[PDB]
Design an enzyme around this catalytic site. Structure first.
Site, PDB file in Angstrom:
ATOM      1  N   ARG A 123       0.825  -1.188   0.000  1.00  0.00           N
ATOM      2  CA  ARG A 123       0.000   0.000   0.000  1.00  0.00           C
ATOM      3  C   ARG A 123       0.852   1.228   0.000  1.00  0.00           C
ATOM      4  O   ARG A 123       1.722   1.403   0.858  1.00  0.00           O
ATOM      5  CB  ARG A 123      -0.937   0.073   1.198  1.00  0.00           C
ATOM      6  CG  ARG A 123      -1.509   1.474   1.350  1.00  0.00           C
ATOM      7  CD  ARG A 123      -2.573   1.567   2.388  1.00  0.00           C
ATOM      8  NE  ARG A 123      -3.127   2.915   2.383  1.00  0.00           N
ATOM      9  CZ  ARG A 123      -3.960   3.400   3.306  1.00  0.00           C
ATOM     10  NH1 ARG A 123      -4.348   2.646   4.339  1.00  0.00           N
ATOM     11  NH2 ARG A 123      -4.403   4.652   3.196  1.00  0.00           N
ATOM     12  N   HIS A 130      -8.581  -0.548  -5.800  1.00  0.00           N
ATOM     13  CA  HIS A 130      -8.654  -1.408  -4.603  1.00  0.00           C
ATOM     14  C   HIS A 130      -9.171  -2.797  -5.011  1.00  0.00           C
ATOM     15  O   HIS A 130     -10.248  -3.206  -4.586  1.00  0.00           O
ATOM     16  CB  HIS A 130      -9.552  -0.782  -3.527  1.00  0.00           C
ATOM     17  CG  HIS A 130      -9.379  -1.367  -2.152  1.00  0.00           C
ATOM     18  ND1 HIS A 130      -9.083  -2.696  -1.926  1.00  0.00           N
ATOM     19  CD2 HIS A 130      -9.497  -0.799  -0.925  1.00  0.00           C
ATOM     20  CE1 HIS A 130      -9.008  -2.918  -0.624  1.00  0.00           C
ATOM     21  NE2 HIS A 130      -9.253  -1.782   0.004  1.00  0.00           N
ATOM     22  N   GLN A 187     -10.992  -5.426  -2.616  1.00  0.00           N
ATOM     23  CA  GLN A 187     -12.305  -5.043  -2.105  1.00  0.00           C
ATOM     24  C   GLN A 187     -13.448  -5.459  -3.053  1.00  0.00           C
ATOM     25  O   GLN A 187     -14.463  -6.023  -2.613  1.00  0.00           O
ATOM     26  CB  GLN A 187     -12.363  -3.546  -1.798  1.00  0.00           C
ATOM     27  CG  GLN A 187     -13.663  -3.147  -1.085  1.00  0.00           C
ATOM     28  CD  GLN A 187     -13.782  -3.749   0.331  1.00  0.00           C
ATOM     29  OE1 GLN A 187     -12.814  -3.746   1.106  1.00  0.00           O
ATOM     30  NE2 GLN A 187     -14.977  -4.254   0.671  1.00  0.00           N
ATOM     31  N   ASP A 247     -19.594   5.122   1.623  1.00  0.00           N
ATOM     32  CA  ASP A 247     -18.228   5.086   2.129  1.00  0.00           C
ATOM     33  C   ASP A 247     -17.963   6.353   2.942  1.00  0.00           C
ATOM     34  O   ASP A 247     -18.572   7.394   2.689  1.00  0.00           O
ATOM     35  CB  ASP A 247     -17.255   5.054   0.946  1.00  0.00           C
ATOM     36  CG  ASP A 247     -15.817   4.717   1.357  1.00  0.00           C
ATOM     37  OD1 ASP A 247     -15.518   4.673   2.580  1.00  0.00           O
ATOM     38  OD2 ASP A 247     -14.977   4.491   0.444  1.00  0.00           O
ATOM     39  N   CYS A 280     -17.714  -0.555   3.222  1.00  0.00           N
ATOM     40  CA  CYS A 280     -16.516  -1.384   3.419  1.00  0.00           C
ATOM     41  C   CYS A 280     -15.731  -1.183   4.729  1.00  0.00           C
ATOM     42  O   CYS A 280     -14.678  -1.800   4.912  1.00  0.00           O
ATOM     43  CB  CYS A 280     -15.568  -1.247   2.233  1.00  0.00           C
ATOM     44  SG  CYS A 280     -14.810   0.370   2.153  1.00  0.00           S
ATOM     45  N   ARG A 301     -13.179 -10.540   3.088  1.00  0.00           N
ATOM     46  CA  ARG A 301     -11.827 -10.116   2.745  1.00  0.00           C
ATOM     47  C   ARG A 301     -10.846 -11.285   2.904  1.00  0.00           C
ATOM     48  O   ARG A 301      -9.915 -11.465   2.086  1.00  0.00           O
ATOM     49  CB  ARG A 301     -11.383  -8.915   3.583  1.00  0.00           C
ATOM     50  CG  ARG A 301     -11.917  -7.533   3.106  1.00  0.00           C
ATOM     51  CD  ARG A 301     -11.459  -7.165   1.671  1.00  0.00           C
ATOM     52  NE  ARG A 301     -10.046  -6.777   1.585  1.00  0.00           N
ATOM     53  CZ  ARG A 301      -9.586  -5.561   1.912  1.00  0.00           C
ATOM     54  NH1 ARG A 301     -10.424  -4.624   2.357  1.00  0.00           N
ATOM     55  NH2 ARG A 301      -8.283  -5.275   1.816  1.00  0.00           N
TER      56      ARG A 301
END
Ligand code: CL
Ligand code: CL
Ligand code: CL
Ligand code: CL
Lengths: 314, 314, 314
Positions: free
Chosen positions: C105, C132, C135, C234, C268, C295
């Site tokens: 990341r 992402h 996700q 989000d 998320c 995940r």
């Protein structure tokens, strides 16, 4: 009583060549999709503690990887984790009683010896003020591959030129080269010379070797590089920058001082732009990245020797 | 519904003696180069999460080692890692759904219960404001070895003297000693006494035991040490230093108060020089280092019981 | 040359459906006390490096767990651990030579590509400025379960409504939905729209699919929610709080705009109280916690595909 690895000074010439051959061997097998029988599950169920006093990510990466190939668990204890709020004696007895090995980095050398003195399990020196055993093993692995009986790696009569500051890495490299019949020449500014305690260990390392490596001390870089097979430097505030003026490793330095036509370059990383030129660093002369990777192979060899073989090197 | 370990108050006298015998057994086998069948790969493929609110290196070292003997993976999540930027409910449901166990340390006890309330996997209390279950198990393992049927460790009629502050460690030790028919006497300054909620749990622990351990409360140290088999203290700002004047454990305190000729010393570490004298700490009277190592053996026992045996202790 | 996972844009519609079916399959087997043959010891002896530029505990928890199910070792290198004191080229060549995978990341996307460009092992994008991938895989796993041949998950003609800011997560979700024949509608304030480079990748994703998912762009929330099967938001300073006034997901928004009777909710995590109401978050409409757990299952699938199968998805 456990046997520790604090410096190349603790190894016979035979024991040192054997660690290097083993790393070379394990490297060839693993990089072609196989596992050596000696290594499989050799450390399973077992924890190795890593004690670091200042950040050292590069060292972590290779120790971590080496332990895991043997099926063991690496435990990271950094400077926010752990002789301040508890005596050095206590920490040493307690941690060593619940692990199988300690890989440690501290500041002064007086610190690491005291820890080892009271540890009940083998201690390996990750880096201290005056020694860096793991690095020497990596560096000689690299040299042995690029220039490709029991008490020698067949390197007699080679020349290494060190240009820059006299530090921990050079010290152990020097002691190794002496045992291997390799000649070393050292260029440093006035005030930045090898400490005479170190010169004493190099000289003692001469004993019992039929063709030991010779030591040369100079203030002029052009003198050191003469007939050199390899050129090495290292990271070097206000006082220092003026002092190292002519010490930058360059193409123009090699030709001017008269180094061999095919001289190779070595630096143990990280590199800053003061010690060496971009042109040199990235040429086909530069063994820098293989040298960095050889840390992984050197840790496997060393941990097998000191932890699994309880110090009987074979 | 998962079963948690928050305090010795959750264990019957039989269940507690069994955890201690198991740790003793596993210790003897592993220290002589063998693996118990029950433990081999018992946790493989599985993660245990360690949640720590303040630094606690000592606790980490033993949990980490214990998980690895069972072939599992320990995951460290410290105070820079993780109820501030996300509700306590959410964190609890989410983390527990991707691990097999949580070993947790927090501040207030209200905190740990709420976490456990919504965890779908067993929670073990690493240390909180009022309890420390893992420590009691270690301490009784140590006592059991040094003074060497199912509902007892054969320790009836022993005396423990606690001298110092009333804290989390003492609380659980007291509850354990009561179940084991061991007498405890507690010396503390005015203002630093056992909270009456704790006295209530000790008293409730009396129920159903034919010879329970008795509780004694005093302000004078010389009174507590009378006929004591073991003496225990713990780490204790400006207000405090004047208050604990005569509370320092010394050779002169034992003779003066009339403790047994062969009394032994215990402290759960780290130690500072205020609670106990150097002479005492390092004598042959001191079970300090074995007690520290018994944390490893106590974690193996507890994790087997709560995670692998899903709470059926045997 | 290694194959990387930087974005859903790198996957065919077949390859994407296969990753999702695999995660679903592995999830069902493991949650009922079994191990898939394909996964057992698939990564043993091997290290996966996790490189994180800012804290990201949630991502760590699932990567860590996923690697361990495969018998490998996960190595955490955070922002205090590791292009500042050493060139990005060097770090990339060196680390990749001593590990089997990097999960990374960073901040800007230009950063991650340069790293991958010089890595000798597969790189997976943990999160960057615009993508992402992990996700999206989780989110479609969740959708596939709740609404329960090779180039489709059987989801054609569904509607997704996104209400809030246009960010990394939405971008990849949009690209996935298009490949799967799922309709997406996006409500955002003036100034917070999908970047036109992203609209370009969505459009390119249309190519070769017989019934692609359609894109709708709006400034009014009540317009987006019309006939929606799922509603997503989000996390969104002073400038922003006034701008998102009517953007809070509520029961009253669904009825008013005319969403389906049984619409479901997705976010998320972590959640703050500005984007969505407590009533909605905790209703039986909310797939939030299963989505969080998916995940773990998505990481297993992705790491098997890119590391073990060296990029041949099957
Ligand atoms: Cl550190
Ligand atoms: Cl591990
Ligand atoms: Cl911490
Ligand atoms: Cl971080």
């Amino acid at each position: 009583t456990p046997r520790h690895l604090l410096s190349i000074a603790d190894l016979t010439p035979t024991e040192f060549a054997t660690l290097v051959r083993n790393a070379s061997s394990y490297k060839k097998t693993i990089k072609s999709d196989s596992m050596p029988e000696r290594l499989t599950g050799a450390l399973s169920g077992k924890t190795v503690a890593m004690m670091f006093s200042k950040r050292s990510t590069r060292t972590r990466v290779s120790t971590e990887g080496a332990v895991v190939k043997m099926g063991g668990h690496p435990m990271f204890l950094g400077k926010d984790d752990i002789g301040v709020n508890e005596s050095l004696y206590d920490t040493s007895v307690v941690i060593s009683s619940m692990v199988s090995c300690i890989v440690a980095r501290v500041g002064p050398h007086s610190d690491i010896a005291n820890l080892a003195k009271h540890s009940s399990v083998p201690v390996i020196n990750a880096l201290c003020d005056t020694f860096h055993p793991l690095q020497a093993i990596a560096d000689f692995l690299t040299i042995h591959e690029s220039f490709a009986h029991p008490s020698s790696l067949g390197l007699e009569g080679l020349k290494i030129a060190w240009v820059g500051d006299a530090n921990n890495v050079l010290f152990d490299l020097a002691i190794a080269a002496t045992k291997m019949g390799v000649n070393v020449a050292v260029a440093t500014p006035r005030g930045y010379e090898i400490p005479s305690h170190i010169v004493e260990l190099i000289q003692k390392a001469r004993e019992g070797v039929q063709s030991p490596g010779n030591l040369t001390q100079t203030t002029v870089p052009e003198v050191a590089v003469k007939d050199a097979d390899v050129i090495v430097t290292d990271t070097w505030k206000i006082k220092r920058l003026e002092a190292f003026k002519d010490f930058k490793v360059t193409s123009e330095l090699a030709k001017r001082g008269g180094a061999k036509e095919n001289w190779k370059f070595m630096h143990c990383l990280p590199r800053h732009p003061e010690e060496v030129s971009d042109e040199v660093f990235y040429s086909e002369r530069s063994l820098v990245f293989p040298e960095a990777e050889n840390r992984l192979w050197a840790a496997i060899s060393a941990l097998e020797a000191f932890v699994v073989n309880k110090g009987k090197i074979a």
